[PDB]
Structures are given as structure tokens and as C-alpha cells.
Amino acid sequence: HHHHHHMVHITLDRNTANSWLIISKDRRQVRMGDTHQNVSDNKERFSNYPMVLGAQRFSSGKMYWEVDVTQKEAWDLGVCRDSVQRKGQFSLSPENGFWTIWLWQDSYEAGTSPQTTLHIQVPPCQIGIFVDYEAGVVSFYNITDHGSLIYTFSECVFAGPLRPFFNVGFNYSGGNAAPLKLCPL
Ligand SMILES: OCc1ccc(-n2cnc3ccccc32)cc1
């Protein structure tokens, strides 16, 4: 792919974070804490899952960013509508305003309804995410495997401003403590 030139500087929005997340001073890294991180509750925070949004909102154009997932066992990445549900249980699907992929139990899947099996020969350490708002496209790239395509959501009906979306996952196993990191341009 030749999407690198649409690179955008993404930062995390603390106010949307699950109350157990720890976001770095530069707002470029996030990990699961051991405990509640001593913040007040609000209507924006994701309650059920270790999720957080980027601060940036996109309503036009082409955007590209990269995320480091080194040594994690579980995570979700992509974009979502600014107005997605924050409280209670929900599925990651385009019907609910999410365009995502994930790792879970040694398999990679795209967040369609129902979910789609991905075919990855080289487990990624960094994922590239490309959004074309006008075209209705969200694509995922394997940066570890020379940028190979992972998955393309096409004919997307965004129906609102988009925000970068992250889930660090739970750490029941003790093998999933590592952070998600936004990689430099
Ligand atoms: O809660 C204990 C605790 C402390 C530090 C970290 N940690 C910070 N950056 C990391 C990068 C990779 C793996 C673990 C990392 C995790 C867990």
C-alpha cells in the first residue's frame, strides 16, 4: 500500500477511557491497570470493557495511523462512530457503529456480524489502519509483513463523525499486560 502519506497524529481521550486504563503523559500509549485508576465516572467512559477513543474526529478525507500490539494476547482496533454506546454489553459490528478487527485466543477476526476469520501467516507486531471517509472504506495492514492487506470493510455507512477505537483487552491470563502504542510517523 501507498497510504503512509495520509498519516495523522492520533492521541487518546482520557475522558472516554474505562476507569482501569492508564494512559501515558504523551497520550500515545494505554495499558490495563491492576485496579481502578482513581478517576470520577462520566457518561463517556466505556463501562464493561477496557476501551478508549482517540481525541480526533474525522468527517471527510483519507487518514492513516499505526498501532503497536507487540506480545499482546487480546485486543480490538479500528474506528467507530462518535455516538457508539458506552455503557453495558454490546457487540463490535457495523450495525452498532464499529469497524474493527481483533485478536482473541490465537485467532484474528474482523468485526462483521457474524465475525469473519482473517488469514494471517505472520503475526503482526504493528497494524496500519486506513480510512477513506468519502469512499466508505476501512482497511487494515500488517506492517510486520511488508504492509500486506489484512481486511477491507467496503460500502461502510459511517452515519456520523468517526473516532479511532482501541481495546487493550482483559488480563485474566497474566499474559496480556502489554500496552497498545501509537507508532511515530
Ligand atoms: O502492573 C504492572 C505492570 C507494569 C508495567 C507494565 N508495562 C509497561 N510497559 C510495558 C510494555 C510491555 C510489557 C509490560 C509493560 C505492565 C504491567
Curated annotation (Swiss-Prot):
It is found in: Cytoplasm; Cytoplasmic vesicle, Autophagosome; Nucleus; Cytoplasm, P-body. Autoubiquitinated; does not lead to its proteasomal degradation. Deubiquitinated by USP4; leading to its stabilization. Autoubiquitinated. Induction: Up-regulated by IFN. E3 ubiquitin-protein ligase whose activity is dependent on E2 enzymes, UBE2D1, UBE2D2, UBE2E1 and UBE2E2. Forms a ubiquitin ligase complex in cooperation with the E2 UBE2D2 that is used not only for the ubiquitination of USP4 and IKBKB but also for its self-ubiquitination. Component of cullin-RING-based SCF (SKP1-CUL1-F-box protein) E3 ubiquitin-protein ligase complexes such as SCF(SKP2)-like complexes. A TRIM21-containing SCF(SKP2)-like complex is shown to mediate ubiquitination of CDKN1B ('Thr-187' phosphorylated-form), thereby promoting its degradation by the proteasome. The coiled-coil is necessary for the cytoplasmic localization. Homotrimer. Component of a SCF(SKP2)-like complex containing CUL1, SKP1, TRIM21 and SKP2. Interacts with CALR, CUL1, FBXW11, HSPA5, IKBKB, IRF3, SKP1 and VCP. Interacts with SKP2; the interaction with SKP2 does not depend on an intact F-box domain. Interacts (via N-terminus and C-terminus) with DCP2 (via N-terminus and C-terminus). Interacts (via C-terminus) with IRF8 (via C-terminus). Interacts with ULK1, BECN1 and with ATG8 family members, including GABARAP, GABARAPL1, GABARAPL2 and MAP1LC3C/LC3C. Interacts with TRIM21 and SQSTM1/sequestosome 1. Interacts with IRF3. This is E3 ubiquitin-protein ligase TRIM21. It comes from Mus musculus. The lineage of its organism: Eukaryota, Metazoa, Chordata, Craniata, Vertebrata. The gene is Trim21. The chain holds residues 291 to 468 of 470 of the full protein.
